[PDB]
Amino acid sequence: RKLRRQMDIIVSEVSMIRDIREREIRIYTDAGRICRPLLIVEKQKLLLKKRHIDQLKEREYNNYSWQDLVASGVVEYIDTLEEETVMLAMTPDDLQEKEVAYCSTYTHCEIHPSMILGVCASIIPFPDHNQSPRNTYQSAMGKQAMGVYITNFHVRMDTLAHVLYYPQKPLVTTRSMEYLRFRELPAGINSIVAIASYTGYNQEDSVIMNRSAVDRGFFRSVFYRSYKEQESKKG
Amino acid sequence: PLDPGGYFIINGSEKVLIAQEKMATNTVYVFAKKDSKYAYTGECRSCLENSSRPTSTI
Amino acid sequence: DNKKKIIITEDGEFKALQEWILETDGVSLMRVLSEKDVDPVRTTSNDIVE
Amino acid sequence: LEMGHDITRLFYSNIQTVINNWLLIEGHTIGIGDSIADSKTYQDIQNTIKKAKQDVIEVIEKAHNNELEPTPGNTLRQTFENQVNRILNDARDKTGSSAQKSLSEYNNFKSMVVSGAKGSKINISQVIAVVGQQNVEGKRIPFGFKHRTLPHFIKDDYGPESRGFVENSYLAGLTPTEFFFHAMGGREGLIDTAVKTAETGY
Amino acid sequence: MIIPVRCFTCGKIVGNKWEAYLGLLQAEYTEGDALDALGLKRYCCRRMLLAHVDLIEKLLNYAPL
Amino acid sequence: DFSARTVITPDPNLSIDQVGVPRSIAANMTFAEIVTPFNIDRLQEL
Amino acid sequence: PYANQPTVRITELTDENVKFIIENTDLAVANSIRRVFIAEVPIIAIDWVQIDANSSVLHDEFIAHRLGLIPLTSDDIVDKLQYSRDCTCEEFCPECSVEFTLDVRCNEDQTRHVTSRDLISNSPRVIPVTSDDILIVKLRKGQELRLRAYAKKGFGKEHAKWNPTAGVAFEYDPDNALRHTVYPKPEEWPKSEYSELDEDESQAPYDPNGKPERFYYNVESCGSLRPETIVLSALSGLKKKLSDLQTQLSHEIQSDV
Amino acid sequence: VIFNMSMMGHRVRILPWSTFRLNLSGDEMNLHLPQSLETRAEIQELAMVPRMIIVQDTLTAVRKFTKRDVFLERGEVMNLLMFLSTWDGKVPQPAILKPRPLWTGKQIFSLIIPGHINCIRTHS
Amino acid sequence: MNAPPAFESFLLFEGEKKITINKDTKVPNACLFTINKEDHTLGNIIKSQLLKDPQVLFAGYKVPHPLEHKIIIRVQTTPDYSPQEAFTNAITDLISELSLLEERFRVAIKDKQEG
Amino acid sequence: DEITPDLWQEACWIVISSYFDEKGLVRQQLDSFDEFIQMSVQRIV
Amino acid sequence: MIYICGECHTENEIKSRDPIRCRECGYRIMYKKRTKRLVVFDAR
Amino acid sequence: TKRDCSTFLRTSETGIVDQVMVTLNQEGYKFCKIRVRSVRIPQIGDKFASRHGQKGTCGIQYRQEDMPFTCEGITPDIIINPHAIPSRMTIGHLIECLQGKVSANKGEIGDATPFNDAVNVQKISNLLSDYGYHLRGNEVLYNGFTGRKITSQIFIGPTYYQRLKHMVDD
Amino acid sequence: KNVTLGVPRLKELINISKKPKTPSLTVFLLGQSARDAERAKDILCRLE
Amino acid sequence: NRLTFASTLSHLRRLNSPIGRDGKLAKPRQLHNTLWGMVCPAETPEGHAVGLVKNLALM
Ligand SMILES: [Zn+2]
Ligand SMILES: [Zn+2]
Ligand SMILES: [Zn+2]
């Protein structure tokens, strides 16, 4: 474990699994192993100190990056097999102290539980407040949403490309949204939505819009279809 | 600049290699199947490093 | 009520008495029916093939 | 039956047209205020949840010390799963029933269920009182890892949170452990729904 | 791509306010304080400025024909 | 005469039996009708 | 068997908006007048756009459309001008339209954005409101945007750009005297500015007999038509439409007889 | 026209916009037109929607509409009765004549009920 | 393509009568005014005024369909009175009603401007 | 010293920011191809 | 017709059945400047 | 004699060609690409979907006058059916509306962390009440057609929405 | 007792398949033993 | 999928369940506990191929 934290001949990518009940120690170095970073906890105390965060806060122009954290041994990587015999803590508040000690030996602590979400699920506020099928449904809808896919759309030629007139970053945004860069390139426009049954023109699957708003560019978007053809001397 | 890349352009079409999950190699697994003539299965597919020969399972 | 036996009372009003029922896995209606202290009328299985 | 089909259609059209015009005067809406219940009911819901959680621990303790006696028609492991399920199931119904009484006449949630048009009393229960147990394949969350549902929970843990019992309503917000357990339960429904349509259509 | 001319809800002009909005942000003013200076009392118009993205900046990086 | 498929939207004003159709779709669709003296002029103008 | 006298008073008058209270008026008349401001009021806005050269990053359709949303200071010119349909023209004329032009070219390394000030109009009075400034597009070095545009009178219902009202705050019975709206918990709801009530009183007592009166109006203008003149045109515009109905109505009675 | 083996016939009404309009009481559909007069007559006689047989947006309002609390003023009653196709043309007498007229929701709905049908039901 | 022209809401169709008066045989002294190319802005203007008239027994308006852009007004009066007179007389009151409002507004607008 | 709970919310997101800045969102795609084109291709030959 | 090189952005006249290449660059992708027939745009 | 084999527009949509590209393919033969640009205006047939829940088609479009305006004169851009919220929608829509109203009013982008204890429904409600708004976000909406106040107080908020590729015009 | 219902049973009813999933059988007792609990145990044993 | 930037990111991190005997015997569609922090649980295409196609977790 010390060698893994010190970036010695054993690389942090390598994972060691200790099957205590079977007296088996398994070390895997082959590719294809899915793993995620986890804060290391020693004697019910995080190895990540204030100084580490202070350097990270000035991560730019200081020659400091994420790789340094693994070098110092504060954070390592745990795979599925090693996660089998590795204890986790949701947040430091859970492990710092409790009236009744649920577990007095914490080995690793999750940086933040929200990272379990994917690219499409991460953009959903309050997914816990949301039903599971709805979160799954959004994942499909989010991909089908039209918006600025990239910046160099004019130069390229695509068979299908929908670009929104006014792709506006949302009023309610998740912290993980920054890493996805969805803020820079959003795929929707906010709307002052009043939930009411007006004139009975909206059923469970329906909605009523504002004609004046659309005339001002409420949801208008462009459509691009590329036609290709070549004159070849086949015969 | 914001485009992360990570795909192949073939004949002008951008293609992404979808990861295909496969059973781990050089690992011993014991499974119980009620349809087989035998009670237990000692399945263990063994292969060398990256790949010197086609995977062999016993 | 459906499982419980319904027998016409002396007064006339319908009454459903409490009778023990033994729901058993598998189909052995041919042999189960031909058993002592087993109702040959109301004993029915859920397997149409049997 | 009394008049026929042609007259009945006009009955449908008149109801839809007249009510729609009146709806512009009365109006139907929905908001956070409907989900926000009085503090009195929140304490009762938490108290019932707390009582259920303590009762589950007591049942677990009885099985831990071998005090629990299995029913003649079931085994110890299955009997324990049955007793714990009823305690959690009863709490959801009891807390959910109190939520239904909590809603006032002006409340929009009550109006929908009272008329029976859309939604159900269970939906309000999951929004206000408690989501409830997230059963997978007809049982609680299985031990995907070695005797533990998730790495955070201790080994061989049969508690409410560990086995997927969701004690937090949608409005309050689910814990990180509960969110994954909720996803597992929802995933089963989607898979069943996907195959249900294919089989039923056949 | 670019800030809309006017609010889609009511119709108040918001494009001209974008230039002043950015200038106020670099002037140590708070995100909400700048909106008040521009005169956006309604929350519909404040939406058009508080959470707007100016994509044309990155498009202008590419050279033209 | 199968028509082009299009999305469905509600319309409380229309009767349940009635159905709304756009001009473009109805233009493509045709209905053969036998002309009669009582409606000879109607077909003549159309 | 006749109408009442709509007494009206003004609370505060400013460039952006004007606040006035109308008393002794029916609810239908007050509510109808509110929507008369949005739709019936005619203003001059760019409708016809033609581009001679467009090298900007934005597309031809987007740039041409954006001009329409820009309001024009048509205070009295709109009244004298006439719709293209009723004019004797097949092509736009000064009497049934106005000329607009925008010829700009960016050659400096620094980014240059063309705004409404560069939008030249033949009519000196018919000019953009800002003429900070309504920016149209941002132009890169070597990018030019030369185009010609025209503006014509149009109803607000025809298009949103022809709507001079930047949000109309129409209120009546702020204290809820007639219980037209019932609050489950009136205490929580905040007090409206126009309401005259004490802190400890949630709402005024219900009167068995009463009608909506003392309508509060706050017409906010986008700068095209002054908020003190929109009301004058709206009231005249609403009634002139009403009279037109009577003229056609008389013909129908003449046919029946 | 006929569309979705049991199919329900419909009477086509031309509308300006593109999307189809259906008085449900979403998914794409294709409507089929019977060319022959014989089948057209048959379809309108047995395959029509009335012979085949409410939205959730109306049932919820119906419960509120019939509540005893609901009282309708003369002005409000006029609008509701205008949309009533099966109206005899005579305004029903108000339930509360004084101090001011006030029609109850049931009184307006009474005219909605066609003919004379008697039934007893219970609220949820 | 299928989008209707924006001006059809108020523009009068060629060869189409703006106003059509149709008598109703269901109840005596009843008429229907099927106005075309108008919206609720005009329907509520006359309905409220008609109610104010004591000689009006039943007055109201409705729109068969918003896209149709035509409004239907039904007016019933006493045998001595006529629905046609009610519609004509009500309009005159509105013109007088708005004239006082327009005139009074011009009186008060200058008062605020000067102080 | 130590990260106080009142500051952990901001601190936890800072380390995540560094992880994406260095690794990125497609690091798994690029890394495997880099290994394939650097060693696996040589190994096959 | 007159085309534009995608690298130097300079006018280069290319005739029918002629190789597509920029004299100043050799770049093999060419664009079309614009059409002299203007269209009508309506702000809607 | 030659036979025409040109390529026409795939659909009947009206569009303006954006740019034209002429190249040589790998085989060396002349090869060209052209991008046809068309503008689609949202209409009654377009399908709009919120960030969560089922997509909803635009049942009808209403002018600003016909839309239900509030006391301050804010006609909602979009009106959704309340009957969706119970089952095929989530309370997050109401919470997001409440957060959006506070975010816009206070001029600060709200935090959408799934498991952040700092953000709560009660906390958001308290913040909204400081800006002269109902703590639950409900507002009195005046019906556009008839000016009388609606008996029920509508819940209105700036909810994020996205336009789905599914469009009637296509 | 777990009795398969819904689509799985509906398929098996139309699908005459000889071997269903949970082909349960309901046994009804008669006489004095039908009321007593202990007297019904011997029948349970002799059937199981 | 270049319709949206988020879709492009999801496609690159997309995962596929095993096919053949391995996938057939197991239940790839069902959500397992091991996905916590490794594969997004909510994200999955809707239809018959529900749960077979997934997306890699952010971290
Ligand atoms: Zn606004
Ligand atoms: Zn002219
Ligand atoms: Zn060149």
**Domain match, G27 and G53 both:** no
CB of N48 closer than 8 Å to CB of D198: yes
The residue range of the domain holding G124 is 43-160
Q: Collect contacts of K22-29 with beta carbons under 8 A, ≥24 apart.
A: K28/L23, K28/L24, K29/K5, K29/L21, K29/L22, K29/L23
Q: How far apart are alpha carbons K38 and L10 in whole angstroms?
A: 24
Supply C12's token pair.
Answer: 């006339």
Nearest to D151 by CA among G111, N38, I51, I65: N38
Q: Is M7 on the interface with D (CB under 8 A)?
A: yes
Q: Cβ F12–D16 below 8 Å, yes or no? A: yes
Q: Cβ K40–G159 below 8 Å, yes or no? A: no
**Domain match, G59 and G148 both:** yes
From the CA of E51, how far away is ligand 1's center (Å)? Answer: 14
CB of B56 closer than 8 Å to CB of B46: yes
Nearest to D123 by CA among D136, D135, D110: D110
Q: Cβ A185–E4 below 8 Å, yes or no? A: no
- What's at G41, amino acid-wise? V
Supply J4's token pair.
Answer: 């106080």
Measured over the CA atoms of residue E22, residue E23, residue E24 and residue E26, the dihedral's sign is positive
CB of D15 closer than 8 Å to CB of H112: yes
Phi and psi torsions of E7, nearest 5°: -60, 135
Rounded to a whole number of angstroms, the distance from the CA of N1 to the nearest CA of chain D is: 24
List CB-based neighbours of ion ligand 1 within 5 Å: E 7, 9-10, 12, 42, 44-45
List CB-based neighbours of ion ligand 3 within 5 Å: K 5, 7-8, 22, 24-25, 27
Which of G130, G160, G190 lies at the terminal end of a domain, its last residue? G160
Q: How far apart are alpha carbons C49 and C46 in whole angstroms?
A: 9
Supply L18's token pair.
Answer: 């954006």
A128 annotated active-site: no
The total number of structural domains that make up chain G: 2
Length of chain M: 48
Q: Cβ L74–E31 below 8 Å, yes or no? A: no
Q: Which chains have at least 3 CB atom pairs separated by less than 8 Å from chain B? A: A, J, N
Q: Do chains E and K touch (3 or more CB pairs under 8 A)?
A: yes
If contacts are CB pairs under 8 Å, which of residues 170-199 in chain G contact chain D?
182, 184
Q: Is M25 on the interface with D (CB under 8 A)?
A: no
Q: Do chains C and I touch (3 or more CB pairs under 8 A)?
A: no
Nearest residue in chain G measured CA to CA from A212: G160
Q: Which of G57, G62, G163 sits opposite A165 (nearest CB)?
A: G62
* G222 annotated as belonging to a binding site for a ligand: no
CB of L99 closer than 8 Å to CB of L158: no
Helices (H), chain A: 2-5, 50-57, 66-72, 80-84, 92-96, 119-122, 132-144, 176-180, 211-215
Rounded to a whole number of angstroms, the distance from the CA of A201 to the nearest CA of chain F is: 6
Q: How far is CA I8 from the centre of its chain?
A: 19
Interface mutation target, options H78, H80, H90, chain I, most CBs of I under 10 Å:
H78
Q: How far apart are alpha carbons F16 and H22 in whole angstroms?
A: 7
Q: How far apart are alpha carbons C29 and C27 in whole angstroms?
A: 6
If contacts are CB pairs under 8 Å, which of residues 84-123 in chain L contact chain D?
85-87, 90-91, 94-95, 98, 114-115, 120-122
From the CA of E40, how far away is ligand 1's center (Å)? Answer: 8
Q: Which chains have at least 3 CB atom pairs separated by less than 8 Å from chain A? A: B, D, E, F, G, H, J, L, N
Q: Which of L16, L20, L30 sits opposite K32 (nearest CB)?
A: L20
Q: How far apart are alpha carbons L76 and E44 in whole angstroms?
A: 9
Q: How far apart are alpha carbons G23 and A222 in whole angstroms?
A: 49
From the CA of G230, how far away is ligand 2's center (Å)? Answer: 25
In three-state secondary structure terms, D60 is helix
Q: Cβ N13–J26 below 8 Å, yes or no? A: yes
Q: Which residues of chain J neighbour A176 with C-beta distances below 8 Å?
A: 16
Q: Which residues of chain H neighbour D19 with C-beta distances below 8 Å?
A: 58, 61-62, 65
Q: Cβ L83–H60 below 8 Å, yes or no? A: yes
What separation, in Å, do the N-terminal and C-terminal C-alpha atoms of chain K show? 34
Q: How far apart are alpha carbons I72 and I87 in whole angstroms?
A: 13
Q: Count other C-beta atoms under 10 Å from residue G222's C-beta.
A: 24
Q: Which residues of chain A neighbour N10 with C-beta distances below 8 Å?
A: 118-120, 139, 143
CB of G116 closer than 8 Å to CB of G70: yes
Q: Cβ G62–A212 below 8 Å, yes or no? A: no
**Domain match, G125 and G180 both:** no
Provide the phi-psi class of D27: left if phi over 0, else alpha when psi is between -120 and 50, else beta: left
Q: How far apart are alpha carbons A30 and B47 in whole angstroms?
A: 11
Q: Is M21 on the interface with D (CB under 8 A)?
A: no
In terms of DSSP bridges, do strands H8-9 and H2-3 run parallel, antiparallel, or are they unpaired?
Answer: antiparallel
CB of A32 closer than 8 Å to CB of A52: no
Q: Is L60 on the interface with I (CB under 8 A)?
A: yes
Which of G125, G160, G195 lies at the terminal end of a domain, its last residue? G160
CB of A193 closer than 8 Å to CB of L159: yes
From the CA of I99, how far away is ligand 1's center (Å)? Answer: 33
Nearest residue in chain J measured CA to CA from B18: J29
Rounded to a whole number of angstroms, the distance from the CA of K42 to the nearest CA of chain E is: 16
**Domain match, G197 and G107 both:** no
From the CA of L74, how far away is ligand 1's center (Å)? Answer: 7
Q: Is A111 on the interface with L (CB under 8 A)?
A: no
Give B10's DSSP letter: E
CB of L135 closer than 8 Å to CB of G188: yes
Listed in order, strand segments (DSSP E) in L43-153 are: 47-50, 56-62, 69-70, 78-80, 110-111, 138-139, 141-142
In terms of DSSP bridges, do strands F18-22 and H20-22 run parallel, antiparallel, or are they unpaired?
Answer: antiparallel
Provide the phi-psi class of E29: left if phi over 0, else alpha when psi is between -120 and 50, else beta: beta
G62-72: burial string, b at 16+ Cβ within 10 Å, e else: bbbbbbbbbbb
Rounded to a whole number of angstroms, the distance from the CA of D60 to the nearest CA of chain H is: 40
Nearest to D147 by CA among N33, I13, H118: N33
Q: Count other C-beta atoms under 10 Å from residue M31's C-beta.
A: 13
* K11 annotated as belonging to a binding site for a ligand: no
CB of D32 closer than 8 Å to CB of L155: yes
Q: Cβ D104–G184 below 8 Å, yes or no? A: yes
Supply A153's token pair.
Answer: 């759309």
Q: Which of J8, J18, J32 sits opposite A92 (nearest CB)?
A: J8
* Burial label, A107 (beta-carbon count in 10 A; 0-12, 13-18, 19+): middle
Q: Which chains have at least 3 CB atom pairs separated by less than 8 Å from chain G? A: A, D, E, H, I, K, L
Q: Is the peptide bond before H99 cis (omega within 30 degrees of 0)?
A: yes
Measured over the CA atoms of residue H108, residue H109, residue H115 and residue H118, the dihedral's sign is negative
Which of G115, G131, G160 lies at the terminal end of a domain, its last residue? G160
Cα J42 to Cα B50, B52, D191: the distances in Å are 12, 13, 45
Q: Is K1 on the interface with G (CB under 8 A)?
A: no
If contacts are CB pairs under 8 Å, which of residues 5-44 in chain N contact chain B?
5, 8-9, 11-12, 14-19, 22, 25, 28
Residues 6+ apart with CB under 8 A from L131: L102, L105, L106
Nearest residue in chain L measured CA to CA from K42: L39
Q: Is I69 on the interface with H (CB under 8 A)?
A: no
**Domain match, G22 and G124 both:** no
Cα D146 to Cα A36, A81, A84, D140, D151: the distances in Å are 20, 11, 7, 16, 9
Nearest ligand to the C-alpha of residue G92? 2
Q: Count other C-beta atoms under 10 Å from residue H44's C-beta.
A: 16
Nearest ligand to the C-alpha of residue E42? 1
CB of I48 closer than 8 Å to CB of I61: no
Residues 6+ apart with CB under 8 A from G29: G6, I45, I48, I94, I97, I98
Q: Cβ K41–G161 below 8 Å, yes or no? A: no
CB of G120 closer than 8 Å to CB of G99: no
Nearest to G111 by CA among L19, E38, E51, E54: E54
In three-state secondary structure terms, A129 is coil
Q: How was this structure determined?
A: cryo-EM
In three-state secondary structure terms, H19 is coil
Q: Which residues of chain K neighbour G64 with C-beta distances below 8 Å?
A: 41-43
Angle in degrees, CA A157, A162, A163, rounded to 5: 100
* K3 annotated as belonging to a binding site for a ligand: no
Nearest residue in chain E measured CA to CA from L76: E9
Nearest ligand to the C-alpha of residue K14? 3
Cα G71 to Cα G74, G225, L80, N13: the distances in Å are 9, 9, 31, 48
